[PDB]
A paper describes a structure:
Additionally, we introduced a probe at Tyr205, a site that modulates the interactions between the B‐ and C‐ring propionic side chains during photoconversion—a critical step preceding propC deprotonation. For Y205oCNF, the crystal structure of Pfr was determined experimentally at a resolution of 1.79 Å. This structure reveals a very high overall agreement, even in the CBP, with a root‐mean‐square deviation (RMSD) of 0.28 Å compared to the WT [name] [name]. However, introducing the oCNF reporter group leads to an in‐place rotation of the Y205oCNF side chain by ≈20° compared to Tyr205 in WT‐[name] [name]. Together with the lack of the hydroxyl head group in oCNF, this alteration leads to a slight restructuring of the HB network around the BV chromophore in the Pfr crystal structure. On the one hand, a new water molecule is visible in the oCNF region of CBP, on the other hand, there is a slight shift in the head group of propC and a different rotamer orientation of Ser260. Since Tyr205 directly interacts with the propionic side chains, initially with propB and propC in Pfr and subsequently in Meta‐F solely with propB, one may readily rationalize the effects of the substitution on the chromophore, which is visible through small changes in the Y205oCNF Pfr crystal structure. One exception is Y205oCNF where the nitrile substituent in ortho position in Y205oCNF cannot replace the hydroxyl group of Tyr and its HB interactions, first with propB and propC (Pfr) and later solely with propB (Meta‐F). In Y205oCNF, this coupled process is not completed at pH 7.8. It requires an increase of the pH to 9.0 to achieve the same signal pattern as in the other variants and in WT [name]‐[name].
Phytochromes constitute a class of biological photoreceptors which harbor a linear methine‐bridged tetrapyrrole as a chromophore. The minimum functional entities are the photosensor (photosensory core module ([name])) and an output module which is frequently a [name]. In our previous studies, we intensively used the bathy phytochrome [name] from [name] as a model system, providing valuable insight into structure and reaction mechanism of phytochromes in general. [name] carries a biliverdin (BV) chromophore, which upon light excitation of the dark state Pfr photoisomerizes from ZZEssa to ZZZssa and subsequently runs via a sequence of thermal decays to Pr.
Residue numbers in the entry:
A (entry chain A): 7 to 80, 86 to 95, 97 to 119, 127 to 503
B (entry chain B): 6 to 80, 86 to 503
The structure:
């Protein structure tokens, strides 16, 4: 039995149940024999008796088995409006772990949605409009986008909602809210469908076969839901969901999460459209993200080139840097910047106090090998840094010399200080047996604890810019030494 | 007016007044209410009697078809295969509006597969290519196999607008053009404009009788702008060129990278030939995918090359940190810098002493080069692919070194790391037959591949392959890495 002590390793790929909005037949790798079936196959497909040990041809008929075998030559195959008795079923077909899984549901959207995002020319504009578009088109009560942080936490970066709902915009949930196996399954599958968070699960018969093997439902869209997540949704009032996974650089960037406060499942044709939309969204996001990065790096290069040209006509470089250092804050996101040269401090924005800087400089001198050194958790490196964490919890240090402990220092505030949460601190949630852990309020509190005394991480882009600055300043120092 | 070699650079190829004979064309007002012009063959092709101009579109084409076409104009020219005409027959129709004119183009329908299926089969056979080279090599073979043309080439445009034949699939009896170049002037600016605006250009018959658009010039003195009409007739100049080659027909797919014309996939046939509209739609889809995949592969290759350079320069920095004598280290190491970017030679000029590796100017030539760079550079990288143009005397050694990229090593001494490239003609890898000759027409031998190639060679005589933006970025990284080696050296010694 799953609970809060073991939900981190819950084997959610092998639950032994499906959701009730479809039925499932598992055959051998050659689609010759029925090995397992969901208990609701009889009712849904109009079949009698234990289906296990009947041939696929027997159960499905000659035509359908032929058509499915053909589809299996060609991601699960999605076959809307297949003809069985002359009825229509939307069929999903795949093979995994030497098992053929057939899923049945009783039977230009993509182009229209894509056309409404393809002209977005910033990441911000893309993510803002997508929740609104998806909500209107797919008819869910709420649509959110989460962006995963470096530590795996999710940030709610976009939201469209019914006017009567509470807001989660600007909120974060901890990494632990989505277990590693769920993340694996959100990388492997574009869509995750939950038709009813209070729907009675349908057993796969048998759950464990004569060889002792569970049925791996990793790629089955009907796979049942963890009791943990069902309780979480029930506490929220959510009754149904569908996520579209967002893939950037071959990895899970985040989710488009659609939540409904009553049961809901989109027809397979619409799901296919949503999947196509998701692929386009991911690719457009990646392209916009690349452009933003390029522009930011080019901005830094341009600024540093201006600095190099400026410095060429200054006899006193220390003075120039005392007069100029504040401008370096524009190179990358930061809340403060400062110059530590010849044991003299010059600060701008949110920095540690004057008297704290020696200790920091000493620490970097010990820890660095003459390149950029950066942390988003100062107090972990330097316990006494805790006192000023409110002002400066993260530091990036650019060395100005290999023989002297002189630095250009960038700082960031504790991440909780920069929060822009649109939600309602008064909003409370009912709970079930597992208690308040499974509520947005507690999730948010847990996240805050995970990032206490910490700042926003220095990204790979931030570090590239810092390295550009380091080398630019080396050049300033060198050309000065050449002349003068 | 007659086009010839003196004025073909500005031939108004958008308004020829004719179409090709493999379809017919009707021009209507912007509302598709009235027929304003038609190709002379509309009568024969669509089975219409009487002068078409002045009649309503509904009269000529039937209310149903006009209704459908009007609908399509609401939802690039629209490509509408297998449209049912008033007499029950099927026509593939291309429909667009431009310069307040609606242009309807008709071809008899054949039997065709869905475009998306044809395109998917092609795309599946390139989508797994994981280098630009592999993509480019396989695409001519695939396109030739799918489309059934006698030759398929890919051209990549050079910085100067010249085309290089970078891939070829051909009938065994044909001559090869692989590794050949044609000069920029072989494709006039307006032709380039129309290859940016139109994914496909179709020529069914380079010796086909042109069909007049009636009237060529309307009552108001206006010609019909056929910029986006697929049936638009072909310049006599190019028709002559094709005939000299023995080519009777062609189709090009434009390749768009970073919003501009990267090059073409050019299909040539030695007998009159045209693809069905459904296959043309598939080709367009393939072209779009090809362009995107190329861009992705090109980005990866660039990233790999920059990262390779950074890794090498980082190794050099770490190496230099434990060397008391940096000049000595460079004297022993400089040849390795040739691996940073494409070059035929590299050398170190320090303290009026030369060390060279590969193809470089002679020892005696280096002082003049360094003095020139010193006067021409503001302390950043300086590079040319045309040394003789900067330094007349460099002509003597252009075969060995026609291009130079100079990295300054000091702001107070004219010390440099120099990269060189041979004259581009020296690095040709032409698979063609020097004894292959071409017949000519009235315009003479200008309009032949042999003369095109000779003209190109003249345009790049004494010149090397240009130093690319990537090359220049790598050079800049090397410059600042060497600044850093010098600075840290001064810090400790
Ligand atoms: C130890 C196990 C836990 C757990 C399991 C699972 N969570 C799954 C999905 C999921 N959970 C959340 C959590 C949220 N925290 C918030 O603050 C918030 C909203 C304000 C939510 C919804 C999210 C965001 C997700 C992703 C899906 C979605 O957003 O709809 C999950 C997968 C279920 C499935 O699809 O099979 C499992 C399993 N949840 C916990 O809270 C911990 C204790
Ligand atoms: C002053 C005008 C000239 C001219 C006009 C046009 N050329 C057009 C297309 C074209 N021409 C070439 C030329 C080649 N040079 C070679 O060496 C070679 C093969 C080995 C060729 C084919 C090319 C490559 C192209 C692009 C199309 C293709 O490759 O099939 C053109 C457009 C015609 C149209 O489609 O309407 C015009 C106009 N050609 C000249 O040579 C100069 C004098
Ligand atoms: Cl468990
Ligand atoms: Cl992002």
């Amino acid at each position: 039995h799953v609970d809060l002590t073991n939900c981190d390793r819950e084997p959610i790929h092998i639950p032994g149940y499906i959701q009730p909005h479809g039925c499932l037949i598992a055959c051998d790798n050659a689609m010759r024999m029925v090995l397992r079936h969901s208990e609701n196959c009889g009712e849904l497909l109009g079949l009698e008796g234990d289906l296990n040990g009947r041939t696929a041809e027997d159960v499905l008929g000659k035509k359908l088995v032929h058509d499915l075998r053909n589809a299996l030559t060609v991601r699960p195959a999605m076959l809307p409006a297949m003809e069985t008795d002359g009825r229509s079923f939307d069929i999903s077909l795949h093979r995994y772990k030497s098992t053929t899984i057939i899923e049945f549901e009783p039977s230009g959207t993509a182009r229209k949605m894509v056309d409404r995002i393809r002209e977005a020319d910033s990441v911000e504009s893309l993510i803002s409009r997508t929740t609104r578009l998806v909500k209107a088109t797919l008819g869910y009560d709420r649509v959110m986008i989460y962006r995963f942080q470096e530590d795996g936490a999710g940030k709610v970066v976009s939201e469209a909602k019914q006017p009567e709902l509470e807001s989660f915009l600007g909120q974060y949930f901890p990494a632990s809210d989505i277990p590693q196996q769920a993340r694996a399954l959100f990388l492997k599958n574009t869509l995750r469908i939950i038709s009813d968070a209070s729907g009675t699960r349908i057993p796969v018969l048998p759950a464990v076969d004569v060889s002792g093997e569970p049925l791996d439902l990793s790629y089955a869209h009907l796979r049942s839901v963890s009791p943990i997540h069902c309780e979480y949704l029930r506490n929220m009032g959510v009754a149904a969901s569908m996520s579209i996974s967002v893939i950037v650089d071959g990895a899970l960037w985040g989710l488009i999460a659609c939540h409904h406060y009553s049961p809901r499942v989109l027809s397979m044709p619409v799901r296919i459209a949503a999947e196509m939309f998701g692929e386009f969204f991911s690719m457009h996001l990646q392209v916009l993200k690349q452009k933003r990065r390029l522009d930011t790096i080019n901005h830094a290069h341009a600024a540093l080139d201006r600095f190099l040209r400026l410095a060429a006509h200054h006899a006193n470089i220390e003075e120039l840097l005392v007069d100029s250092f504040q401008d370096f804050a524009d190179l990358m996101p930061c809340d403060g910047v400062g110059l530590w040269v010849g044991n003299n401090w010059h600060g701008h924005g949110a920095t540690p106090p004057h008297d704290a800087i020696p200790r920091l400089a000493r620490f970097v001198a010990s820890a660095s090998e003459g390149r950029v050194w950066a942390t988003h958790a100062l107090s972990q490196a330097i316990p006494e840094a805790e006192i000023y964490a409110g002002t400066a919890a993260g530091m990036l240090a650019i060395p100005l010399s290999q023989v002297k402990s002189d630095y250009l220092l960038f700082f960031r505030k504790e991440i909780v200080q920069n929060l822009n949460w649109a939600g309602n601190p008064e909003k409370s949630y009912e709970t079930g047996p597992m208690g308040d852990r499974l509520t947005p309020r507690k999730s948010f509190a847990i996240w805050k604890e995970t990032v206490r005394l910490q700042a926003q991480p220095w990204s790979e882009a931030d570090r590239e810019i810092a390295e550009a600055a380091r080398i630019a300043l080396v050049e300033v120092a060198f050309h000065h030494s050449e002349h003068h």
